[PDB]
Amino acid sequence: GFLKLIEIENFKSYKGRQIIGPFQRFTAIIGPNGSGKSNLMDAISFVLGEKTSNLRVKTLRDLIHGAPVGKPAANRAFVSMVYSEEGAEDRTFARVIVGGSSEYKINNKVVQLHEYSEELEKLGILIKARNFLVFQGAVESIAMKNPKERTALFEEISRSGELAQEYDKRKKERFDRFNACFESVATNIDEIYKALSRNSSAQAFLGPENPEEPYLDGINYNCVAPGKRFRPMDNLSGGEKTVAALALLFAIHSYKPAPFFVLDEIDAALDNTNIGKVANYIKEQSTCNFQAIVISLKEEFYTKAESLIGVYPEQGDCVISKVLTFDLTKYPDAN
């Protein structure tokens, strides 16, 4: 499971035909302030089936470079993802804007979106659930969830909330959904918190309030920071409360894990007290469990990446973005 490269033609500010990557196991996307970086977040969401309304446009056609000011650079645009797999040939998944409507392709076969989604699903990519994506501020949203809405998120992921209406009009099925999801998250959560904060004198515990009817009551989450005694997560303060939320979010994504993980400015919510720690965690994870693609603002984060994709603007009637690639592994480690 590997995202090898992305190819773009006339998508938003990515005018003309452009290769993005190749990616390493840990690649960071960087550059000075502009739409260039988020437009590349949008290209990834787009080739993975995202609905037009979450792509910051009103109409598909407006994704064609130049189209927002009625000066489109072409009649079509596309984003292509090359997926590589040891022992197998590469597989190319493209979404093309043709006739103002999306045309999905797998290795030059035009396909319906339903087959596109099925074929990605066999690869571990869930384009409705977006298991591969951590959006901006996802860490903050997790940090501020009371046990009742921490359950609300779990039934969203576990499809327990799907069965909610026929159930409460009367049930073995709704349980299997939750605990196979929950116990998976709870199984892994203690190790992830021990890994983010580097020392093993840390502990994190995930217990339901209603141990055999959990979909109903809240979910409790109690941590053990190093320089602290055992206390719940709600009673934590900033710098370490964030590291506790990261463990919860990562543990969530480790159930039904995607082969690659796109982190959109996750280092925004990090201090000099923990940014280097989280960045080494991503580095260690990228050697085995998943590929990491991060969009990053903080040097202390992205200097752990193996590769940098650096985005820069070109002068034009419209904002034009292009990319550079840079290998960091050739240089000695710093401090």
């Binding site: 290769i19 990557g21 190749p22 960087i30 550059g31 000075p32 502009g34 040097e299 992205y302 200097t303 590769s307 940098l308 650096g310 985005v311 820069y312 603007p313 002068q315 550079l324 690639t325 840079f326 290998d327 960091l328 240089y331 000695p332 480690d333 710093a334 401090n335």
Partner: protein, 60 residues
């Protein structure tokens, strides 16, 4: 005049070389330089740009 990025990073560590790379991006944005990269992960060549008429040797 021209400057090779890889030659500017010759004797650097990871954080230093990343900052020279990031600085090409910023300088390009300010139109102090133009940038060429023939293929992915090749050397990146900086050339004079419209909003700076001095020495590239100076800029770095």
């Amino acid at each position: 005049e021209s400057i090779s990025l890889l030659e500017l990073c010759r004797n650097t560590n990871r954080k230093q070389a990343a900052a020279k790379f990031y600085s090409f991006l910023v300088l390009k944005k300010q139109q102090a330089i133009e940038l060429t990269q023939e293929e992915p992960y090749s050397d990146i060549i900086a050339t004079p740009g419209p909003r700076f008429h001095g020495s590239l040797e100076v800029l770095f």
